[PDB]
Scaffold this active site. Structure first.
Site, mmCIF file in Angstrom:
data_model
loop_
_atom_site.group_PDB
_atom_site.id
_atom_site.type_symbol
_atom_site.label_atom_id
_atom_site.label_comp_id
_atom_site.label_asym_id
_atom_site.label_seq_id
_atom_site.Cartn_x
_atom_site.Cartn_y
_atom_site.Cartn_z
ATOM 1 N N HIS A 64 0.836 -1.183 0.000
ATOM 2 C CA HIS A 64 0.000 0.000 0.000
ATOM 3 C C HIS A 64 0.881 1.247 0.000
ATOM 4 O O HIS A 64 1.930 1.281 0.646
ATOM 5 C CB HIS A 64 -0.903 0.015 1.227
ATOM 6 N N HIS A 66 0.790 4.602 1.262
ATOM 7 C CA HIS A 66 0.099 5.425 2.240
ATOM 8 C C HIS A 66 0.000 6.902 1.940
ATOM 9 O O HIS A 66 1.013 7.598 1.833
ATOM 10 C CB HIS A 66 0.723 5.228 3.628
ATOM 11 N N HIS A 109 4.236 0.200 2.594
ATOM 12 C CA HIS A 109 4.388 -0.921 3.496
ATOM 13 C C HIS A 109 3.420 -2.028 3.127
ATOM 14 O O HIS A 109 2.333 -1.778 2.584
ATOM 15 C CB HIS A 109 4.115 -0.469 4.926
ATOM 16 N N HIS A 111 0.529 -4.498 3.048
ATOM 17 C CA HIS A 111 -0.822 -4.342 3.570
ATOM 18 C C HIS A 111 -1.443 -5.737 3.560
ATOM 19 O O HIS A 111 -2.588 -5.932 3.171
ATOM 20 C CB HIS A 111 -1.658 -3.378 2.727
ATOM 21 N N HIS A 395 -6.402 4.837 19.620
ATOM 22 C CA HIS A 395 -6.412 4.149 18.336
ATOM 23 C C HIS A 395 -6.327 5.129 17.189
ATOM 24 O O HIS A 395 -7.226 5.946 16.989
ATOM 25 C CB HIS A 395 -7.696 3.332 18.173
ATOM 26 N N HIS A 398 -7.313 5.280 10.192
ATOM 27 C CA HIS A 398 -6.885 5.697 8.876
ATOM 28 C C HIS A 398 -7.899 5.443 7.777
ATOM 29 O O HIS A 398 -8.543 4.399 7.736
ATOM 30 C CB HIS A 398 -5.564 4.992 8.561
ATOM 31 N N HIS A 400 -8.498 5.264 3.617
ATOM 32 C CA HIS A 400 -7.850 5.160 2.312
ATOM 33 C C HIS A 400 -8.599 6.001 1.270
ATOM 34 O O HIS A 400 -9.794 6.289 1.422
ATOM 35 C CB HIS A 400 -7.840 3.704 1.828
ATOM 36 N N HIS A 452 -9.568 1.759 8.965
ATOM 37 C CA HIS A 452 -9.162 0.896 10.067
ATOM 38 C C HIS A 452 -8.155 1.544 11.008
ATOM 39 O O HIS A 452 -7.571 2.597 10.726
ATOM 40 C CB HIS A 452 -8.518 -0.364 9.496
ATOM 41 N N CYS A 453 -7.944 0.885 12.135
ATOM 42 C CA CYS A 453 -6.990 1.380 13.093
ATOM 43 C C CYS A 453 -5.620 1.048 12.517
ATOM 44 O O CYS A 453 -5.422 -0.046 11.978
ATOM 45 C CB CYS A 453 -7.173 0.679 14.432
ATOM 46 N N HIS A 454 -4.669 1.966 12.625
ATOM 47 C CA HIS A 454 -3.368 1.681 12.055
ATOM 48 C C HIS A 454 -2.390 0.972 12.985
ATOM 49 O O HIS A 454 -1.196 0.923 12.729
ATOM 50 C CB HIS A 454 -2.736 2.937 11.473
ATOM 51 N N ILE A 455 -2.912 0.474 14.090
ATOM 52 C CA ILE A 455 -2.132 -0.360 14.965
ATOM 53 C C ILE A 455 -2.301 -1.721 14.328
ATOM 54 O O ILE A 455 -3.287 -2.425 14.575
ATOM 55 C CB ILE A 455 -2.637 -0.365 16.429
ATOM 56 N N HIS A 458 -4.135 -4.626 15.761
ATOM 57 C CA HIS A 458 -5.563 -4.463 15.966
ATOM 58 C C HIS A 458 -6.272 -4.670 14.638
ATOM 59 O O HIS A 458 -7.399 -5.171 14.605
ATOM 60 C CB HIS A 458 -5.877 -3.069 16.509
ATOM 61 N N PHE A 463 -10.258 -4.971 13.630
ATOM 62 C CA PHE A 463 -10.647 -3.594 13.922
ATOM 63 C C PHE A 463 -10.645 -2.760 12.638
ATOM 64 O O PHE A 463 -9.889 -1.806 12.517
ATOM 65 C CB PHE A 463 -9.680 -3.005 14.957
HETATM 66 C C1 LIG Z 1 -5.746 -5.496 23.453
HETATM 67 C C2 LIG Z 1 -4.580 -4.497 23.589
HETATM 68 C C3 LIG Z 1 -4.119 -4.135 25.020
HETATM 69 C C4 LIG Z 1 -2.974 -3.130 25.198
HETATM 70 C C5 LIG Z 1 -2.254 -2.481 23.973
HETATM 71 C C6 LIG Z 1 -1.123 -1.465 24.159
HETATM 72 C C7 LIG Z 1 -2.738 -2.892 22.570
HETATM 73 N N1 LIG Z 1 -2.177 -2.388 21.471
HETATM 74 C C8 LIG Z 1 -3.886 -3.887 22.349
HETATM 75 CU CU LIG Z 2 -6.173 0.305 17.575
HETATM 76 CU CU LIG Z 3 -3.440 4.241 3.561
HETATM 77 CU CU LIG Z 4 -1.083 2.639 6.044
HETATM 78 CU CU LIG Z 5 -4.417 0.885 5.446
#
Ligand SMILES: Cc1ccc(C)c(N)c1
Ligand SMILES: [Cu+2]
Ligand SMILES: [Cu+2]
Ligand SMILES: [Cu+2]
Ligand SMILES: [Cu+2]
Ligand SMILES: CC(=O)N[C@@H]1[C@@H](O)[C@H](O)[C@@H](CO)O[C@H]1O
Ligand SMILES: CC(=O)N[C@@H]1[C@@H](O)[C@H](O)[C@@H](CO)O[C@H]1O
Ligand SMILES: CC(=O)N[C@@H]1[C@@H](O)[C@H](O)[C@@H](CO)O[C@H]1O
Ligand SMILES: CC(=O)N[C@@H]1[C@@H](O)[C@H](O)[C@@H](CO)O[C@H]1O
Ligand SMILES: CC(=O)N[C@@H]1[C@@H](O)[C@H](O)[C@@H](CO)O[C@H]1O
Ligand SMILES: CC(=O)N[C@@H]1[C@@H](O)[C@H](O)[C@@H](CO)O[C@H]1O
Ligand SMILES: CC(=O)N[C@@H]1[C@@H](O)[C@H](O)[C@@H](CO)O[C@H]1O
Length: 499
Positions: A64, A66, A109, A111, A395, A398, A400, A452-455, A458, A463
């Site tokens: 992807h 970004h 990065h 995806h 969280h 992001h 797209h 979506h969350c970019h963590i 997750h 997520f």
């Molecule tokens: C579920 C969960 C708990 C704690 C952290 C820091 C993340 N990222 C996810």
């Molecule tokens: Cu998250």
């Molecule tokens: Cu993106």
């Molecule tokens: Cu991204």
């Molecule tokens: Cu993305």
């Protein structure tokens, strides 16, 4: 850097950016992938050659870009099972798209799953030949790009589902872990009297970072690719996938200064020089700094960020004063994340292909409950109420295909309908602050887009959500090359492990 047209050969390799040797996914030989550059208007033809051999980090890949809107090229966005099937090992695929009314700092990065945590990530910069803020700085090249990475000693699929801390922060590819305090640090050179446009990019998978430079201030001129009114800052809290260009004047005494990137969790602090890098004035000795960190009196606050150019907030200056408003009710049941009672799970047929094949609406598109229809040429407002039902805050969400207006920022109760910045990644704050981050955008890009969350950990846990924007114009608006239509057949033929 490597011009608009280039090859990105993906392979596995032992690497040790923090002194610890570990196998990873590498691009053209290195984990922090090569800096990709080009000028506004340039057509980009990035040929991704997949020569991976390690199944545990996944021999397949998808990339992807970004920040890029990909208007007319939704098939090149990267999201696996959203806009394409993964590329298969022993094969290559061409990402060919143009970048018109866009210029600033980005990154690329994988995806596909959590693969970008294992190394497939790099900085991407698109210069503007007639940049409005050009007169504010003297240097802006390959050496003023600063990348932040959360490096793990254990592979993504082998460690915890939710790590809760990286073994080391990588600044420009280097850094230290509590156990390798003599590992080489990155050095960023500046010459006295010169102004530098530093491009700070987070290629992080979970950590947000509190970035600062001892003895120096920073003038932000860009946020997530959007030109920003100059804002003098003390420190910057940058979340996963965000970007900031800030100008730094080498106006302090010739010396070595500590560059800090303190993560919100994991190995915090700077003992042994971890979470650090070096700012070295020409003439300064090649030694570690000994400058001390001082209290931040001008912390960056998103609320203080404004577009350089007047940019109208879509819709009307009232809550819900928009065509379509949607609230994202966040949830978690242990191993999986939820959005409006649904936990995303990759469909077998990519959503773009589903629509090209006849998908007529949200009800048809899979997975069910994770897809939303969006009418074209309309104003959209989305809200992300921080709920403690969703652990892991804050969280960073992001979107797209679009840049959005942040009408309400985390840690603030204000709704700005006149002056909010636009960006593509936003922190949705946390529950004791009663946050309710709210964003807006106009549907001006037909096609399926991820939200979506970019963590990454997750995202991998569901997520996420998908926006099927203007389904009718989708197939016509995004002509797909033969190589794209071959992706799925070649990928589905692969055996679960022979990936
Ligand atoms: C579920 C969960 C708990 C704690 C952290 C820091 C993340 N990222 C996810
Ligand atoms: Cu998250
Ligand atoms: Cu993106
Ligand atoms: Cu991204
Ligand atoms: Cu993305
Ligand atoms: C990145 C990663 O997961 N490294 C693993 C290591 O932990 C494991 O002990 C080894 C098997 O010998 O394979 C490799
Ligand atoms: C021969 C080889 O490189 N296999 C590696 C393995 O050692 C490692 O545990 C895993 C995650 O990094 O990736 C694979
Ligand atoms: C321009 C400005 O706001 N002045 C600040 C000063 O108050 C602060 O003590 C110093 C920290 O490095 O950075 C500068
Ligand atoms: C999606 C949206 O903005 N509408 C709701 C509205 O129906 C409700 O009365 C209010 C209080 O819960 O929250 C908001
Ligand atoms: C046992 C239980 O109640 N937990 C389920 C979990 O297994 C499932 O993965 C998730 C999403 O489908 O919904 C919930
Ligand atoms: C990840 C996933 O598919 N979720 C499953 C769900 O389908 C199933 O109902 C549950 C057991 O009851 O285990 C979990
Ligand atoms: C609980 C909370 O604060 N979240 C609010 C929600 O009530 C409202 O429906 C939405 C639309 O404005 O904004 C958000």
């Amino acid at each position: 850097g490597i011009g608009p047209v280039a090859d990105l050969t993906i392979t596995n390799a032992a690497v040790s950016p923090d002194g610890f040797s570990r196998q990873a996914v590498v691009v053209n030989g290195g984990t922090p992938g090569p800096l990709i550059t080009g000028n506004m208007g340039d057509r980009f033809q990035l040929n991704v050659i997949d020569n991976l051999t390690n199944h545990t980090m996944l021999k397949s890949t998808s990339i992807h870009w970004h920040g890029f809107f990909q208007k007319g090229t939704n098939w090149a966005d990267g999201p696996a099972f959203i806009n394409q099937c993964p590329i298969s090992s022993g094969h290559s695929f061409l990402y060919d798209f143009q970048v018109p009314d866009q210029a600033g700092t980005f990154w690329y990065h994988s995806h596909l799953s959590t693969q970008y945590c294992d190394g497939l990530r790099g900085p991407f910069v698109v210069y503007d030949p007639n940049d409005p803020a050009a007169d504010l700085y003297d240097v802006d090249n390959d050496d003023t790009v600063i990348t932040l990475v959360d490096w793990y000693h254990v592979a993504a699929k082998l460690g915890p589902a939710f790590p809760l801390g990286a073994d080391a922060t990588l600044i420009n590819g280097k850094g230290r872990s509590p156990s390798t305090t003599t590992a080489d640090l990155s050095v960023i050179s500046v010459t006295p009297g010169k102004r530098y446009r530093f491009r700070l990019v987070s290629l992080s998978c979970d950590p947000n970072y509190t970035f600062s430079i001892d003895g120096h201030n920073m003038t932000i001129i860009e946020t997530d690719s959007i030109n920003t009114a100059p804002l003098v800052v003390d420190s910057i809290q940058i979340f996963a996938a965000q970007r900031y260009s800030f100008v730094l004047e080498a106006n302090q005494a010739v010396d070595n200064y500590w560059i800090r990137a303190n993560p919100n969790f994991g190995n915090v602090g700077f003992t042994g020089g971890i979470n650090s890098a070096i700012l070295r004035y020409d003439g300064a000795a090649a030694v570690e700094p000994t400058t001390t960190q001082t209290t931040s009196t001008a912390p960056l606050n998103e609320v203080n960020l404004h577009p350089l150019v007047a940019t109208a907030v879509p819709g009307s200056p009232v809550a819900g004063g928009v065509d379509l408003a949607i609230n994202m009710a966040f949830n978690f049941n242990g191993t999986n994340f939820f959005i409006n009672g649904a936990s995303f799970t990759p469909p077998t047929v990519p959503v773009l292909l589903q629509i090209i094949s006849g998908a007529q609406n949200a009800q048809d598109l899979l997975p069910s409950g994770s897809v939303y229809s969006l009418p074209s040429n309309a104003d959209i407002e989305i809200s992300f109420p921080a709920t403690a039902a969703a652990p892991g805050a804050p969280h960073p969400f992001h979107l797209h295909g679009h840049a959005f207006a942040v009408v309400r920022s985390a840690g603030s109760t204000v709704y700005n309908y006149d002056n909010p910045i636009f960006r593509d990644v936003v922190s949705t704050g946390t529950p004791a602050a009663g946050d309710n981050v709210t964003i807006r955008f106009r549907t001006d890009n037909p096609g399926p887009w991820f939200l979506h969350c970019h963590i990454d950990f997750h995202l991998e846990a569901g997520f996420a959500v998908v926006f099927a924007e203007d389904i009718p114009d989708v197939a016509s608006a995004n002509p797909v090359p033969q190589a794209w239509s071959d992706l799925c057949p070649t990928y589905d033929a692969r055996d679960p492990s022979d990936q």
